[PDB]
Design a protein around this ligand. Sequence first.
Ligand code: SF4
Ligand code: SF4
Ligand code: SF4
Ligand code: FES
Ligand code: FES
Ligand SMILES: [Ca+2]
Lengths: 156, 148, 905
Amino acid sequence: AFELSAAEREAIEHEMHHYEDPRAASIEALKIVQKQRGWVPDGAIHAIADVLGIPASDVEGVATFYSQIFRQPVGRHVIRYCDSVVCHINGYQGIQAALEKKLNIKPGQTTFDGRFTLLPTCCLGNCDKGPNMMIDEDTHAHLTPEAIPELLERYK
Amino acid sequence: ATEAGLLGKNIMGTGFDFELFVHTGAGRYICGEETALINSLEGRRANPRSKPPFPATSGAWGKPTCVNNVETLCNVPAILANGVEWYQNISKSKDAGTKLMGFSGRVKNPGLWELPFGTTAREILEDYAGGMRDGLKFKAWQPGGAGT
Amino acid sequence: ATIHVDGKEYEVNGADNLLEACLSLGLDIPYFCWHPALGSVGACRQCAVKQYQNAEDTRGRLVMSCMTPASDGTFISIDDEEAKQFRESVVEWLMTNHPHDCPVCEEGGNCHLQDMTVMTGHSFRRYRFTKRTHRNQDLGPFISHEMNRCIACYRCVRYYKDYAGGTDLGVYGAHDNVYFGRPEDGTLESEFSGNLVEICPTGVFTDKTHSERYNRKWDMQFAPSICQQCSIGCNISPGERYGELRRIENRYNGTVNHYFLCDRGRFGYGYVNLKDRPRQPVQRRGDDFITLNAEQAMQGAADILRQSKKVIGIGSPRASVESNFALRELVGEENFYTGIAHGEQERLQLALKVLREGGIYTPALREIESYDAVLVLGEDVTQTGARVALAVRQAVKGKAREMAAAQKVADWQIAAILNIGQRAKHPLFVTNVDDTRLDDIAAWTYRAPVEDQARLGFAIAHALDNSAPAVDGIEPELQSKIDVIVQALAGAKKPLIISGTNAGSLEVIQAAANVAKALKGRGADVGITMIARSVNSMGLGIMGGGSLEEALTELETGRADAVVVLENDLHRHASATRVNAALAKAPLVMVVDHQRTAIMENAHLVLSAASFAESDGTVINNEGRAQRFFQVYDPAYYDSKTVMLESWRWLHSLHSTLLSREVDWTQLDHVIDAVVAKIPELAGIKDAAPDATFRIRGQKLAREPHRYSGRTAMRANISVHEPRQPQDIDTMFTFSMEGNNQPTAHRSQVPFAWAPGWNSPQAWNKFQDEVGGKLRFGDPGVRLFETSENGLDYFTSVPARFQPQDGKWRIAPYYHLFGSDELSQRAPVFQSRMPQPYIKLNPADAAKLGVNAGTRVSFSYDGNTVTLPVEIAEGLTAGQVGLPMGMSGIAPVLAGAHLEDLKEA
Ligand code: SF4
Ligand code: SF4
Ligand code: SF4
Ligand code: FES
Ligand code: FES
Ligand SMILES: [Ca+2]
């Protein structure tokens, strides 16, 4: 039981205006659906395939290829902590341990109330200010393990 | 730039039409490869392509396509404004121009500085990055990121 | 071009890459992701060889032979130490996550991955960590899915999307979690999905129909045969075990059906293994059903045939050439009737006259992939001649191929070809009563009744050449579409026109012939292709005879007191009530058939004939190529009471007992020579295959591999004394492994492909002069007729515009690849694939009748008030009812007929 809303439909059509191939708007269509609903459900693949004209297999392959197109349900806020080499030097392990102590979950799962979903991510391009962490649209730098509990309370 | 006569139709009275778009990615490292970038721009999975053919002859949607870094396109207006001979006379090195260099990782002042080519890595570490932090010794370094 | 492999000089073709050039020369390079039909992508990285640019070079560079052109002056090494270690490492990396599944794998012994693991010489495992696993999907009744065995070689998706045009198979996942399949569970609805079991080098996609009764490849007894499920005549390799037809493998014919079959011809073979088939001659005495052997059946049948005043014979397009000829020579020239109806025979003879008298060359199926602009008139090709639709897809992608070839891009660089030719493709114009499966690549689709399709064809012929008869009354929008078609066809270099007898109209074939004549008159390399209905429709048309209605009225008026029906159910070409009354009125009905048809209740004598898996014969396909199919197994080897013989043998021995009161079992070459002696138009069937005296250096051709097992134990439950192997006096093959199956043997009939080190279907590489090209020493089967020096004249009988008459409903045929064949629908595996019987209706006509989608309405045809549920068809024109041809109770002869009393009940 899935159906694209109006605003998603004109957003996808306006992004199809940008390219000479309707296939080229698939990533942005998936991102629009993900922005509206938090993630991309099963019927969204076929609905985007219908609105673009491409087969649903290609839409599923694009949705499962990219890590930031979530094909499983996530929480209200997506915590994304960098685990790359410079933040490993700067000690991302303490930040991850503090997040595990606070949220009481493993990386990849969602809390029972659906508030936070914890995810490792690649380099955020802020290695001079490491360690970094990307909450939904906000990047946080110069992290310390004691700043995690004071920093997780601004996302209700 | 579009409202102030710099992008769109008939730019600066010449008669040249150019439209600029921003395509926000979906978070995959392999998308930075130029042929995988072209594949991702076409709405496909970002598998790279074999070369030849190069993207200059058949790139995005089978058309001639040139893929360039941000810093190259940021170097080009200085070349077109201050001249070419000025650009060749920035440093006495075989690599013309200035590169954004810098040290990161447990140093005193990690950052990013514009330096000419030929500056040694020690000058970046002590004069700009300040050297290692308090009570820390130097063991190794990587010049160009994670893939070096 | 000249290359140097390991210091040896070789002359290769410079337009090929190094992998196919070296595989053509007999050099073994391991490979996974490359296929001769699909192209080169450089994925598996298995084909590494060390390249040198000079004759004096020590270091070299490891390159991919599939991605490296075979230019002049390249010095490559295959068995260099670095290249061998890299190929062994690639095999080892593929072996890190591969499951310990070879005993419980259907691809074991037929596995390309096994062959390439053995060829690289990797047999020691140093990987000690875990192996990744995958869940499996349900892909329908035909294809079994086992995702753990995948090596991520991308052959399946490349074939299924870039070749077959399918839309529900793809790559999903990530770094090393790549998944290959469907986004959900469901049946693969591509009509060519069955080729995945041979495209996939591993056991991911397997034949579920073969997996039900599974045996290994060495245990299979193979034969070269021709698929009998439609008129295209694809070469197949049926393989049996323990007296039952186990699998249908693809048999390479570089002229017809090179690497790919269709799903009907690959999974529709289950009628052979039915237990209701007749296995003895059965004679009816009142209510008793007594069983005779061959001699008493011949003596009794000849006695009643001599005690009758006239004997007539009703053949079938399902029978071979020899069996129909034996019936004709048993009953006489004037007493022989073709089993098809009058309209079907008229369409068939018109198509044959166009093919062998129209002066336009009819292409082979491989040659269809080279034509520029394709116009399909009336034919639903993907449901009747599906392999022609696959070749049409290839011809459509020919535009992207030529556009990439204009930019100095190699032929085998398939990814670059698809990149340059993004969506530009060759023009395709299909006409049908509804939407087709070629509409995703068709430049235009015309949904109209067959009269309007014929009128559009005549308008195209008139606009191409003004000497063609004109049709008046065409709308200006239709005129614009017609002139678009005319500008596309006139600008083409090799136009192709495809029609057939399945459209149910004569004027469609006339319009296609006129379009082809107009294209030929402008000086164009036009080809024409007629799609017949059954496997040997063209042979029955060439041999000819009366229609089924003439035989029915001969039986009804009483002039014929003896009717011999050869492999015909007679309800497919005529109404069941009239046929039942005619056969009940006749005092002797003698039916030679291998499937339990409905007319056997009225049959006074039933002769248990042999199917294609148990008989030898010749079949003429839709392009006029005579092809010989050979017997796979002897039915009486296991089951000793089985008396099942070739139909031509039945009828020849019956005629001998009729004439000289002696039973004479003939030979296949004798019947072949009789056909060449009596019918000069069937003279080419002698050269279709060599006779039974043909030997390869004195020995015969083996039907089974040299490692065929269980010889002293497969019959030990019946008796511990192993009998002699059955003797094949008809053909040059033997029912044993004591024979020849070399890749370098001077023959054209290959039962199966096996080479030392090549157990997969990749073993066909050794049996070709060049890989992906022709078969070595020529392809089997010859053409019956050549292109005539002069052509026909313009057909001036332009039909009128279809006006929907009130009360009467025109029957629009809806053919299905699973369901519209007579014998394929009897397979038990097709029951889960055949669509439910739905009558298709316009929204306007259903709104007028008050019917919505789902409910049942009843219609009466020839006193049969049958009720079908309604499916709403938007593309169907008003005034027509869409009916599925070939289903239960709906004959293909119903196409184009009327339908009275269509009411909701
Ligand atoms: S796919 Fe081949 S190698 Fe893999 S388990 Fe099956 S037979 Fe063995
Ligand atoms: S499923 Fe088979 S054909 Fe497809 S990538 Fe895997 S091994 Fe290759
Ligand atoms: S296209 Fe016809 S002859 Fe070929 S495999 Fe299919 S049913 Fe058989
Ligand atoms: S390494 Fe973490 S932000 Fe770059
Ligand atoms: S066959 Fe060349 S890389 Fe696969
Ligand atoms: Ca025989």
